[PDB]
């Protein structure tokens, strides 16, 4: 089963397969680039997460980030449980050198459609994973 998410590392692995991928090391330091996941199903049974060859901000996916400004530092950090409000969520993690794979599993229908963001940081480079999960599709 595929991971609806973003692979930022240059390590292509069969242990985890991502729908989208963007090599972070090829992104400029001053660029505002994001990789976008949009789920729109009546009921869900999906893996969502990312593979970051650097550092993950915040501690995704137990914490996520909902922004309201083009700020440099988040500090507006919410928790996935309160944001999705689907009850018990299964969280995952795996390593592969500097590669950090963080996942979560969503099963069922969510009350209100919600969006959140996770940041992959490599040196001065920074890419956003923005996911949107629809309520009814």
């Amino acid at each position: 089963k595929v991971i609806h998410g973003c692979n930022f590392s240059s390590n292509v692995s069969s242990k985890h397969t991502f729908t989208d991928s963007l090599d972070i090391s090829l992104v400029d330091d001053s660029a505002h680039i994001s990789c976008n996941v949009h789920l729109s199903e009546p009921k869900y049974n999906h893996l969502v997460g990312l593979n970051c060859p650097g550092d993950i901000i915040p501690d995704c996916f137990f914490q996520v980030y909902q922004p309201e400004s083009e700020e440099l530092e988040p500090s507006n950090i919410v928790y996935l449980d309160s944001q999705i409000n689907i009850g018990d969520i299964e969280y995952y993690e795996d390593a592969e050198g500097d590669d950090k794979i963080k996942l979560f599993g969503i099963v069922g229908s969510i009350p209100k459609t919600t969006s959140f963001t996770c940041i992959c940081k490599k040196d001065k480079k920074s890419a956003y994973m923005t996911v949107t999960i629809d309520s009814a599709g």
């Epitope: 501690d59 137990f62 500090s75 950090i77």
Partner: antibody
Framework: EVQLVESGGGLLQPGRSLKLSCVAS????????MSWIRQAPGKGLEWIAS????????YYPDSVKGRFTISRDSAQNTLYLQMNSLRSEDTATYYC????????????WGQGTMVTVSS | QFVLSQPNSVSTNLGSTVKLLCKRS????????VSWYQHHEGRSPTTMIY?????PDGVPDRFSGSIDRSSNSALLTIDNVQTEDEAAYFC?????????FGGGTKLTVLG
């Protein structure tokens, strides 16, 4: 304001166990990386350990890898650095910092604690 | 990943101008942010410069951070040197997984 107050430490012998405390206050504790920085006598600053907001990421250099353990308490607002199987080399002034991971610097430093290991 | 190199010790006079270097061994100095820390003896280090050229509140306009790409090194510049500036200065930079500190430069204000 933000305050970082360290505790623990003292005089130990090689092979024992120590646990330092760092009580943080004045900010949302679960939203910041925390680190431990030491300064050996007659030496420069040396990084020891870093932990993320909820411990989703932990780093060590190869010197204290396996010997030291860094963790935190969300409710007590305290950061710890468990020290086991020490050495005379670990005799240093141990500092506690709050980190801004997105900017890769330490914006607030603790008052510093002294750990002396000798036989 | 790399090593930051600083002069062991330097010395200038009052009201003069000193530049403390921080040479990165391998890689580009601009690929990673650089931070500067002032350390007095028996005192906690205080942040002097963050992400290359930013100066936190409470740090005098005297101190400024700069990136010299030709020498692949960062510079902490202190105009109108004061005796209170006499301390140790450390540069810092982070690569994924390891925090790099320079050796530190013990500044001396010839008073």
């Amino acid at each position: 304001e933000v305050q970082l107050v360290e505790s623990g430490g003292g005089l130990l012998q090689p092979g024992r166990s120590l646990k330092l405390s760092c009580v943080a206050s004045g900010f949302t504790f679960n939203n910041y990386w925390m680190s431990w920085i030491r300064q050996a006598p007659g030496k420069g600053l040396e990084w020891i350990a870093s932990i993320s907001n909820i411990g989703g990421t932990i780093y060590y250099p190869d010197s204290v890898k396996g010997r030291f353990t860094i963790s935190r308490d969300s409710a007590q607002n305290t950061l710890y650095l468990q020290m086991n199987s020490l050495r005379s080399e670990d005799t240093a002034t141990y500092y506690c910092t709050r980190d801004l991971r997105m900017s890769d610097y330490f914006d607030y430093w603790g008052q510093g604690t002294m750990v002396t290991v000798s036989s | 990943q790399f090593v930051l190199s600083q002069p062991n010790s330097v010395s200038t006079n009052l009201g003069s101008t000193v530049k403390l270097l921080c040479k990165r061994s391998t890689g580009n100095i601009g690929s990673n942010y650089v931070s500067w820390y002032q350390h007095h003896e028996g005192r906690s280090p205080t942040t002097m410069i963050y992400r290359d050229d930013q100066r936190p509140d409470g740090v005098p306009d005297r101190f400024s951070g700069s990136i010299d790409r030709s020498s692949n090194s960062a510079l902490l510049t202190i105009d109108n040197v004061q005796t209170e500036d006499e301390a140790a200065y450390f540069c810092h930079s982070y690569s994924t997984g390891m925090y790099i500190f320079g050796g530190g430069t013990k500044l001396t204000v010839l008073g």
